[PDB]
């Protein structure tokens, strides 16, 4: 499942580059596994006679050893060039898949993480893929070829002690390291998660740096980050201590077992039972074997470490008449936000909704917008349930102007093209007049105006006008205005709301406001209090009967 | 400049670990540079003698070669363990320095770049320090010892051709690689900057993902990112192609010059002019020299690459107050001919003259372009590049420190800045030494003591941008922060807009009662807030068009007449 995802990230070019890395590393392993027999033939030849044909043969063997070294050094440079070229090839498809994965996630899941967390999650996952790609193509065929060749030729020389101890080392190595690889993977995954938590805390402090600066308390903001970095260091030191203990125990086992083979051949050469050519062949195999053993040690650890951390990443990723009947909602089971709210709204009519901050005006309208789907009750559109409507169809029929502004760090043209991609440059400027954003500071507005992070190069009211302009480019049946014109003066506010009603005449408009101006101009007003509709009717009728609406009208005087 | 900054990042433990890495790498280089002489002596002892060589001396030499190999393999493992331990040691001090560097920057410089850019900037800079630490500890003493040793012993054997060509190789290598290292550093820095630009665009799409989702246009958001990644790939391929061309030219030079030395000693051994012991010593030197040459090639490139990219980071982030000034209890604001521009193209505020006094509530209004927020941001000390003068009790704003100004003036911003932490953390931002009972008293003052008919716990975790609380409930957190501070001037820039008439009027009354001797400046487009004030100021197109009582301005002023038409 996880390997399938990695194989899908590479294109036709990526497949070739991956198999070229696997081929080059396998071919190099065959060539270098011949080297110790060449040294053995050089060594014995030196002890013997030194005829004309013995010097010519020595020179030939010296060239073969040189070719063996050159082939291995050219293969590590070719693996490097192909590996980096494959990194470039895979990263574009990996990043685009991640962005499209985030687009398909629900609002609740999106809001629980952080951008700094999100960008660093891609960094950790992309690294794990790079690690896994390297370990297959490089640490599979290459070490097996070299370990098999070593045992085969040492068995051929009838040296049962060397071939036996060499086999014994691989057998103990694989058993011991796989018995501890699970502990290394857990400690590394736990460290990487704390690392993500440290990035979210840094990202959070930088986004609210203006608030931290004006309230001072550099002590408070830095202590929070210092405690996150201390948790990060302790988790890193735990992994460091275990991995270094494994490296030292694996090194100590190598000097005992391979050292025993070295002393056995030393005593063999002294007593006259073993030849110098065979002794040099054995010592050169001890040195040769270190590289494949290092690759097996990395293969076992990096596959269990990167597979564990990449498993966590994949898991994390995995004419309209509105009729709301007995709608009940809770964010957490502990506390009830909306209880049995029953409404019946009709096309072409402008409705108003008000109440205190805890009543749940935004929640109710977010459920109509399809932000949250875990609700008890029924919401219909022309006798069609919201549950039976797709998110794409609901986004076309209903347009929700959020309480908070979401301005993209790009041109004004990009911010308006978010509402409609096929919009002509003349059509976008027509929408600017409708949003009263055609002229700013007695100079015309250009669509190429670059807007900085959070659109803070524009005033609060000017940001609201960008969001209102996006509405004019869409074609909805239901329009929801959740305190979207609060930072506008009475002139701009009334001018834009009239433009919404004229351009969208057959539109069900739901307006959330705490001001008399917006409540008076509506067909019907609904008072939501502690999650339930306490009062309903015309604004003038509510002024007398309802206490909350009455007190709102007396603020004008 | 740069190296001093890196040396300061290491503590007493970091200094030891760094010099241990430098020592272990240098010691190992001496030991391994002996190895080709041991092989020469093995070869000579066997060569010629028909098994009449001393076996005891052969065994001793075989053990010395084995020790030389083991010492070198133990040194790379010790370097690894010390390097990773030094990475852990240095990263905490590096990250804390970066956060405190960002705190001391001005608002204009912080608004230039997104948090995704900020987090990735630390990633790039921390990597560059790691690279530079490795090159100075492992790529300086180790290759010089090995290159000097090789030339010295080959000169000792009177082999002027091998010693000459080996010197020729190093001389051509250093000249050719340093003549291209400038091109590599430029291409890599340009690639790393495009990488930061890609991270800012991803971070920007995720922060506005809800807006992208509800408007659809996955096409638009993905195409923006696809074009950023294509710019990233093209910049990477440019560097890849040049570095691989350098590697192939350096490799081809090595097979020509070191191949010439190999053939010369081959013909020397065939003709009988050179010994086999000397031939093996020369070939083993050819093999040995690859590792130091690789380290010199890395030293030249990685210092010019990492120093170039780390210079940009230091430049962007790195680039007269009264000592222990005692601010008065009661402060009067005197703004004389204040003029301000964000960019030289247009004037935002022109010659605005005000005189506000302690204990009095003033109102400020006008259109969106007039600059109410900008004017009050300048009083708050957001921007310092202004023409004119602003005084506090005949003390210039320029002569007041940022910490003293933040104590005397509290500015309630138009936008809410809620920290992703507990409610206690969000309120302790205003005062660190606040008692748990004192913080709950402030919650009543902000009408945030009870929510949803249940008492508020100070341990309530607030999510990203505090979006687990309503828009009005977020404003109450900001208002609660005011009650924990002790200011002389309070500025309310549309800070109660998302509150109903009950909460709004209840909180504003609580502000005036708790801070009686406070100069209050209120920005609003609503009649409710303008009527309740001692004096109203109309700002239009960057200048004060009208000043006086609300009733006097109601008739005369055009802007306030447009507001009065509600009923
Ligand atoms: N994401 C969330 N998780 C948990 N509780 C939430 C969340 N969003 C809102 N609430 C709570 O739900 C209640 C209603 O929130 P909301 O619907 O935003 O308020 P509102 O009635 O629109 N008020 P206002 O926007 O301030 O004018 C409050 O008690 C909030 O704290
Ligand atoms: N950072 C900035 N860079 C450039 N122009 C800016 C910046 N901030 C504000 N402006 C412009 O300066 C003018 C005044 O901005 P600002 O001080 O926020 O407005 P305001 O008078 O508070 N209006 P409003 O908040 O909408 O009721 C407008 O033309 C803005 O576009
Ligand atoms: Mg709301
Ligand atoms: Mg403003």
Author numbering:
A (entry chain A): 8 to 325, 342 to 580
B (entry chain B): 8 to 326, 332 to 579
Reproduce text from the manuscript describing this model.
The long-wavelength beamline I23 at Diamond Light Source overcomes these limitations and extends the accessible wavelength range to λ = 5.9 Å. In this study, we report the determination of diverse protein structures by experimental phasing techniques carried out at long wavelengths on beamline I23 at Diamond Light Source using S, Ca, K, Cl, V, I, Cd, and P as anomalous scatterers. Native-SAD uses light atoms naturally occurring in proteins or bound to proteins. We demonstrate that long-wavelength native-SAD has become a very compelling technique, where a low multiplicity dataset from a single crystal can be sufficient for successful structure determination, making it a general vehicle of choice for experimental phasing.
In contrast, AcrB, McjD, and A2AR diffracted to only modest resolution: 3.4, 2.8, and 2.9 Å respectively (with corresponding molecular weights of 115, 65, and 50 kDa). For McjD, two crystals were needed totaling six datasets of 360° and an overall multiplicity of 54. These examples show that S-SAD is not necessarily limited to well-diffracting crystals and the method is applicable even to more difficult membrane proteins.
